[PDB]
Design a protein around this ligand. Sequence first.
Ligand SMILES: [Mg+2]
Ligand SMILES: [Mg+2]
Ligand SMILES: [Zn+2]
Lengths: 110, 447, 246
Amino acid sequence: IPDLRGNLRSFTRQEFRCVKCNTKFRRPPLNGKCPVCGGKIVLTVSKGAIEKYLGTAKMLVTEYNVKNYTRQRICLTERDIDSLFENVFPETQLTLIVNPNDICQRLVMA
Amino acid sequence: EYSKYEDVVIEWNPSVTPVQIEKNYEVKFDVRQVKLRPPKVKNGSGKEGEIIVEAYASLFKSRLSKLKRILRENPEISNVVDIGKLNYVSGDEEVTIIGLVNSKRETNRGLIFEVEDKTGIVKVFLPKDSEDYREAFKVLPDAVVAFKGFYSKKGIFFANKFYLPDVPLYRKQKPPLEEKVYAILISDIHVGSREFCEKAFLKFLEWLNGHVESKEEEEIVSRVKYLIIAGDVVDGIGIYPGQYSDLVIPDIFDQYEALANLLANVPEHITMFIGPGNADAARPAIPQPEFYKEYAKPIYKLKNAIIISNPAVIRLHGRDFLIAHGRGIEDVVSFVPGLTHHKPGLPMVELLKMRHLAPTFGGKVPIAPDPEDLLVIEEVPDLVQMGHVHVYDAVVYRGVQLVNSATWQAQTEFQKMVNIVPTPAKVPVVDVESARVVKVLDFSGWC
Amino acid sequence: PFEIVFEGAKEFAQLIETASRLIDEAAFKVTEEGISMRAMDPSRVVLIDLNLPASIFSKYEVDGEETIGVNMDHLKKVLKRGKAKETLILRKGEENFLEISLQGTATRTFKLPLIDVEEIEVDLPELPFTAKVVILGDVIKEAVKDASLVSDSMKFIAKENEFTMRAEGETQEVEVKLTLEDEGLLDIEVQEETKSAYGISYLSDMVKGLGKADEVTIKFGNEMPMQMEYYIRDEGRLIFLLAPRV
DNA sequence: TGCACGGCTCGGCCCGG
DNA sequence: CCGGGCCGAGCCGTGCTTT
Ligand SMILES: [Mg+2]
Ligand SMILES: [Mg+2]
Ligand SMILES: [Zn+2]
């Protein structure tokens, strides 16, 4: 949980860097490419860094007897990760089957 | 020790008949009214890294383009020269530039500003003797400003004037109303906390039902029509480390159920507008379209409750109300020495003068990667509301009232350590016809 | 204890490799009629079904019925060790070990340990498909390869005596059109205008491995999944199901 | 202070045209 | 049979509850 929450918080106040030099900018250039350089601009907190431990956390919440506080914390964290990227990575791909043994949906439905 | 205000029932007082007034309102802005279009990736196998950068760059470009249009409205601004073509200017012409403030540092001679635009970057200097130097001192990065000066081939844009988007000095008064109508401002309830003073809230609810003392209070209550809440309606779950010991209601669902039960005693002739905050079940970063429906359903199920976004503009009898939580005040207070949480009105006036609700990036506020900026104040309102600081305040700046509605949560351990003095149980009363605060209630006795 | 003989181990290796791209583990059902397989990928977006009756097999010998499970990577490697003209032999005894032998210029036998996999039997009922188009493998392979150049999604548009697959990016566009009179299309049977879109990643993953001269029939509807078919030596068949986009 | 992600470069294999 | 494509290796980076 500390890693999930810390990486999620640190994503919204990061510092973009140039891949050729090592100069770091507070906010990305409007042009889109590093001025005074011939390289692109990269992230320092990738999207995959936030959600690397989400699967194991969901397994731990769904397989064992933990207090409701922690279960709700994880179930809100998943929603918060999903909701931040709604306008950049829309859910465009449909799925053939549903209900992958989710605990968040079951808790909400109950 | 887990009561949730289940059996709190308050009945209307059968001694006063509410005046029959035609209710007239419309929501003039909602975050979930514009359909943002994600930025198409310019290659067939674009990976996630570049799309986020493109989205952030597009956000800032949209901010710049939207704020520039406001600057080119007062006739005093003219002859704008693109920074990219700024080099083709003689040494005896006067021109103006507009762009984002990259940074700022102070020296004995004056100030050094770095300004960026869609086409280039330039350095600017402000003489210490300039009448606008003092105003230009309290400007923090990422704001959009205009500078007029003489360009030198030496590589610095020497300037004499500085312009904020600001608010016009003159405006047209609206026609008057047939009868007086009142609205009540609330914020930061924090239901589910050990320090939420419930007795004060119950006394306020009884007051709303006609249990007053004097004749003027009775007359006013018969006219009160609208009630507005500005976020942080619950204490949240897992907000800070070691919060489980501070919660009387350690369950988000039950917090919302208790809040819904509490507000059921509002008279049905009154309409309620509710918006989210930084402790609720809502988007991690601003702007927040709404609550999470599957968690906050009980308050959606109310009959006379309208759920608004953050920020949102509401129109009542032709007067524009702007409602926002107020997370942006912290950045201003941190970046402007001399301002404190005990007089929040001045920071809100500053934010209004910048025509933006949270300019700085990478500070104390989280900004979501949207391909368009929705935090700018496009149209000048007749009232601005805010919260998040738990302190009451009210001021007037060029004909628009700025009101900070206090909290209903008593001072906590953090507020002791950081030395913040909350002012709970203050409830402003505003006249809709004039959009001005005419009376302040005070139910702090029992809190 | 069974003795299965297959001529041309290269084709078997290609078939298993094509099947294994989407999934990781599967259970092979073997009976007196043939071998059948079915599974769904971990992302719950593709379902692959495969059957191989006894007619294709040069020699078949099975008593009863059993399900045999094994990792796809190791089996794929062992099959890749085969040659173009060898004869593959699948044999097993009482011991629960899968013995694979290839008998060409010389006889080499590998041992592959078995693995147990949970079986989730699911059958998606046949849906109302408003279009059935039969085209060669080369045309679809090249169309996918071009479409992947400009965008990560592809679009199908069926019409009476008309088929066309498109793709649009931020600026660039790609379009491929053909008709019955053309040599790339054999038969088209559309009931009403159709439109759908599918991810380019899955289409590329599943298309790779089709000969230039082949028969492929695609069944799709309005905003509903798609089915791809093609026969293996005129008796067996392979079924692909892909969820739509948007 | 160990772990987990994500930009390059940079050769050794392969396979098909 | 010569050439692209794809796939490790090996360097430089980040980030690790907070009213
Ligand atoms: Mg608050
Ligand atoms: Mg708050
Ligand atoms: Zn650079």
